[PDB]
């Protein structure tokens, strides 16, 4: 009497992360008539995007937080459910997955939800240079101090720029950024000592190098004008690129057997499916390019594959008349 | 300035100024590349009255408004736009040559040279042919849909017609029924349905009518029913046209080394065809046909082209 069992609250899909890719997935899933839950912790990467520069249909000064509010409202309108919480763990239970969510930043509860499918859409977050007063960084990060080169390189064209990079591998970006502007000063923020070979290459390109810790970003109305270092060095710059790496929001999947990883990223096929038949991965979490358009299309593909699977397993709806 | 753009070798020419092509043009211009968008007008997305499911946009946004908006953005970043009809693309080694018909009458045929071509010309759905095609246009894209994944939700549990000309196309009834069981199949006089399929439709309760459609009934773009030439009248508030598509790909048929899957182009994960200088986006490439997918394809193709050109270029050094 296996099929005799009372049906448990089992979602068709749970979308982990309510950002660009996750909300796209949620819109599609709900419009496929599927029961889906979006879990969103708040204050993610796209929330700090002040100007989405390059997305068909949207003005290039649209902030990410406005897209999130718009798309969350659309997802709910079509029938998706939203839970504000922090995903802690995903466990494989065979025909379903179990998702533990931390609800409440303090005095937290840990409800567990069951689902046929999981869409991992939790993305990443860029590391920022750490100053005693982080608000001085936040006043410029995402405005004129950029974290993405393909997003904002055009808006840096031929300006005096700082590249903030903590490793020689991260300093390598100077030799890509120079496409947009040759006027690059490299700042390591006291994080690593640059070797002789790289110092010589930077010098041959004319990119000044300063290794002392940054103490203050100068500017007004979110438009940087320069940078001060703890050793007294002061420089002029109207823009910059932070290339200090990222934190990947993937901890809740590290226990899943049968998942193929590429470093911290998940490897997917052409429908955004991982090697696990019940797990999809979108956007910044999957191996590939990190853009809004890419994440949104991933959500489309994942939701469509899930609908195809569920539809194909269902009984036909007949017309009685 | 036709002669101004003739003697310049473009970094990329975008064929088709729809969803995928304008995405590519926006990225190409913002990569500081010189690109040309060639657009004939009145494409598939132009007939989309409501983009239902695209992050950031109200679900009643018409495609023509997105096209106007994104064409303006592409031009703002530095893309060039030519209103014309791509006739041919020729492989000349390190560059490609693109011939464009300019002017519907008394036409000129400028030929442009470029390092890369982005094929973004999409498809167009076949429509049921009536003596008065305006009767179809009054409902097509409003309540008579051409895409199931786009509009299925908006058909939920409504009385619907499936217009299908082959048994393979009638198969869609057994997918559409997910959204609504109240399906009537209309073959529009195009095919005689075999016995096994007729029995399956009858067993599901989906009525079948094989007579040619003569009129769509309704008001204010809202269907209310359909009339057939044999006098049959039926009630329906929505429908799905499943009659196939014409692919806008003829200008690529002379290129050796392109991998085709039927009429679609096979691409890798950066939307590149098997030809290293040709990318294919959206409805033309093998894959899912949605705005989001086409827009992302444009992102990927433009990024690969920038990577190729930049990596081939000399460093920009700072002379103090
Ligand atoms: C360009 C840019 C600009 C930025 N600007 C700002 C800014 O202006 N102001 C600012 O504060 N930050 C900003 N940030 C982010 C900043 O760098 C830190 O990552 C951020 O402040 C960390 O916040 P947090 O530790 O509270 O959240 P997290 O690090 O996500 O939270 C830590 C822990 O809190 C718990 N938790 C979090 N959310 C929830 C929830 N919803 N429910 C239950 N438990 C939860 C979990 O146990 C989690 O492990 C910016 C980042 C970038 C890339
Ligand atoms: C300053 C800035 C400017 C940018 N500009 C552009 C641009 O102009 N064009 C462009 O294409 N891209 C831009 N981007 C990049 C863009 O934001 C990302 O590429 C995009 O958001 C990727 O989408 P996602 O859905 O993968 O991630 P996100 O959109 O970041 O969404 C992931 C979501 O998961 C949530 N989350 C994470 N961990 C957990 C957890 N444990 N539980 C619950 N929820 C969780 C986060 O809070 C977040 O909301 C910019 C980014 C920044 C920082
Ligand atoms: C009625 C309707 C409703 C829809 N609703 C939705 C929806 O709600 N959500 C969704 O995701 N999708 C929807 N779609 C599908 C969506 O429009 C396509 O998937 C998308 O537009 C694909 O973009 P594309 O760039 O590949 O093609 P298109 O956007 O069609 O662009 C191709 C362009 O190429 C041009 N062109 C063609 N041939 C030539 C030539 N020889 N020379 C020059 N130019 C040429 C065309 O005029 C056109 O402007 C809908 C489609 C229709 C018909
Ligand atoms: C849902 C839906 C709704 C529709 N609604 C309508 C509608 O309301 N009204 C309507 O007319 N159609 C509508 N259509 C399209 C219609 O079905 C036909 O495909 C369309 O009318 C054909 O136009 P055309 O004869 O210009 O063909 P096209 O292929 O556009 O043009 C034919 C020839 O014209 C020349 N040419 C075209 N453009 C140019 C240019 N810019 N420069 C130089 N030469 C050029 C080329 O040599 C080309 O081979 C709709 C389609 C769909 C799917």
User: Is any atom of ligand 1 closer than 6 Å to the C-beta of A180?
Assistant: no
Contact indicator for B16, B122 with CB cutoff of 8 Å = yes
Contact indicator for A177, A184 with CB cutoff of 8 Å: yes
The angle at the Cα of B247, spanning B271 to B185, to the nearest 5 degrees, equals 115
Give which of A290, A271, A289 is closest to A281, Cα–Cα.
Answer: A271
* Three-state DSSP state, B314: coil
Closest C-alpha to ligand 4, atom 7: B137
**Helix (H), strand (E) counts: chain B:** 9, 19
Distance from C-alpha of B238 to C-alpha of B216, rounded to nearest angstrom: 11
Whether the CB of A153 sits within 6 Å of ligand 2 = no
CB spacing of A301 vs B293 below 8 angstroms: yes
Q: How far, in Å, are A29, A38, A301, B51 from residue A73 at the CA level?
A: 14, 12, 21, 16
How far apart CA A77 and CA A72 sit, in angstroms, is 8
Contact: A293, B288; criterion CB under 8 Å: no
Which range marks the domain in which residue A225 is found?
Answer: 126-244
In chain A, residues with a C-beta closer than 8 Å to the C-beta of B156 are 33
**C-alpha to C-alpha distances, B175 to A276, A319, B181, B184, B242, nearest whole angstrom:** 26, 14, 10, 13, 12
Q: Out of A78, A179, A319, whose CB is closest to B153?
A: A78
Q: In what order do the strands lie in the sheet with B213-219?
A: B213-219, B222-228, B233-235
Tokens 């007063």 correspond to what residue?
A: A133
Across the interface, of B59, B77, B317, the residue whose CB is closest to A182 is B317
At B87 the three-state DSSP class reads strand
CATH number at residue B163: 3.50.50.60
**Closest Cα partner for A118 from A248, A33, A10?**
A10
Indicate whether residue B121 lines ligand 3 (CB < 6 A).
Answer: yes
B189 CA from centroid of ligand 4 (Å): 24
Please check if A54 is assigned to a binding site.
yes
Rounded to 10 degrees, what is the CA torsion of A56, A60, A64, A65?
Answer: -120
Helix orientation angle between A292-312 and B291-311, rounded to the nearest 10 degrees:
140
- Both structure tokens of B139: 């409902």
* CA distances, A130 to each of A45, A172, B310 (Å): 17, 21, 32
| Of the candidates A19, A41, A48, the residue with the CA atom closest to the CA atom of residue A119 | A19
Label residue B65 exposed, middle or buried (CB < 10 Å: 0-12, 13-18, 19+): middle
**DSSP type of residue A251:** G
Position in ligand 2 atom list of the atom nearest CA A20: 25
Q: Where are the beta strands (DSSP E) in chain B?
A: 9-15, 35-39, 80-83, 85-91, 96-101, 111-119, 123-125, 144-145, 160-164, 183-186, 208-209, 213-219, 222-228, 233-235, 238-242, 245-247, 260-261, 264-265, 278-280
User: What is the distance between the alpha carbons of residues B190 and B208, in angstroms, rounded to a whole number?
Assistant: 13
Which pairing describes strands B238-242 and B144-145: parallel, antiparallel, or unpaired? Answer: parallel
Residue A105 C-alpha to ligand 1 middle, in angstroms? 11
> Closest Cα to atom 12, ligand 3: which residue?
B290
Q: Give the DSSP H/E element, type plus range, for residue A202.
A: helix A196-205
Nearest to A289 among B29, B30, B299 (CB): B299
Closest ligand to B43 CA?
A: 3
Q: Which ligand is nearest to the CA of B110?
A: 4
Q: Which of B24, B56, B183 to mutate to test the interface with A (most CBs of A within 10 A)?
A: B56
- For ligand 1, is residue A252 a contact (CB within 6 Å)? no
The reply to whether ligand 2 has any atom less than 6 angstroms from the CB of A299 is no
| Method by which the model was determined | X-ray
Residue B161 per-residue DSSP state: E
Ligand in closest contact with the CA of A272: 2
Query: CA angle B284-B287-B292, nearest 5°?
Result: 85
- Using CA atoms, how far apart are residues B26 and B290, in angstroms rounded to an integer? 19
**A74: closest CA of chain B, how far (Å):** 8
| Triad A93, A99, A102: Cα angle to 5° | 150
Nearest-angstrom CA–CA distance, B272 and B249: 15
- Establish whether residue B38 lines the binding site of ligand 3, counting it when its CB lies within 6 angstroms of any ligand atom: yes
Strand partners of residue B264 = B261
In our burial notation (b when 16+ CB lie closer than 10 A, e otherwise), range B218-233 reads beeeebeebebeeebe
CA distance A279 to A285: 12
**Preferred mutation among A34, A35, A36, A57 to probe B, highest tally of B CBs within 10 A:** A57
Taking the C-alpha atoms of residue A152 and residue B318, their distance in angstroms, rounded to an integer, is 20
Number of other CB atoms surrounding residue A258 within 10 Å = 10
The protein residue with its alpha carbon nearest to ligand 4, atom 43, reads B104
């Amino acid at each position: 009497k296996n099929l005799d069992a009372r049906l448990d609250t089992v979602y068709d899909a749970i979308v982990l992360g309510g950002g660009m890719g996750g909300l796209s997935a949620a819109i599609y899933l709900a419009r496929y008539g599927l029961k889906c839950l979006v879990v969103e912790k708040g204050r993610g990467r796209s929330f700090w995007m002040q100007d989405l520069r390059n997305y068909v249909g949207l003005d290039p000064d649209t902030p990410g937080r406005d897209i999130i509010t718009h798309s969350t409202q659309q997802a709910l309108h079509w029938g998706a459910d939203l839970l504000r919480g922090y995903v802690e763990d995903v466990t494989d239970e065979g025909d379903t997955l179990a998702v533990k969510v931390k609800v409440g930043k303090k005095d937290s509860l840990y409800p567990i939800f069951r689902t046929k499918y999981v869409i991992a859409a939790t993305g990443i977050i860029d590391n920022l240079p750490q100053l005693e007063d982080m608000q001085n960084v936040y006043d410029y990060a995402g405005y004129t101090l950029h974290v993405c080169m393909i997003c904002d390189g055009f808006d840096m064209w031929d300006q005096k720029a700082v590249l903030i990079a903590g490793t020689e591998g991260q300093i390598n970006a100077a030799f890509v950024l120079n496409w947009f502007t040759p006027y690059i000063t490299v700042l390591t923020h006291g994080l690593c000592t640059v070797g002789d070979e790289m110092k010589a290459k930077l010098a041959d390109h004319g990119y000044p190098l300063h290794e002392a810790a940054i103490t203050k970003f100068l500017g007004e109305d979110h438009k940087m004008s320069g940078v001060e270092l703890v050793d007294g060095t002061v420089m002029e710059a109207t823009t910059g690129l932070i290339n200090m790496g990222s934190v990947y929001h993937n901890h809740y999947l590290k226990g899943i057997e049968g998942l193929e990883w590429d470093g911290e990223n998940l490897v997917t096929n052409d429908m955004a499916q991982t090697s696990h038949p019940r797990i999809f991965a979108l956007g910044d979490l999957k191996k590939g390019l990190n853009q809004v358009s890419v994440a949104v299309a991933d959500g489309t593909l994942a939701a469509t594959q899930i609908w195809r699977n569920i539809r194909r397993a269902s009984e036909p709806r007949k017309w009685i008349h």
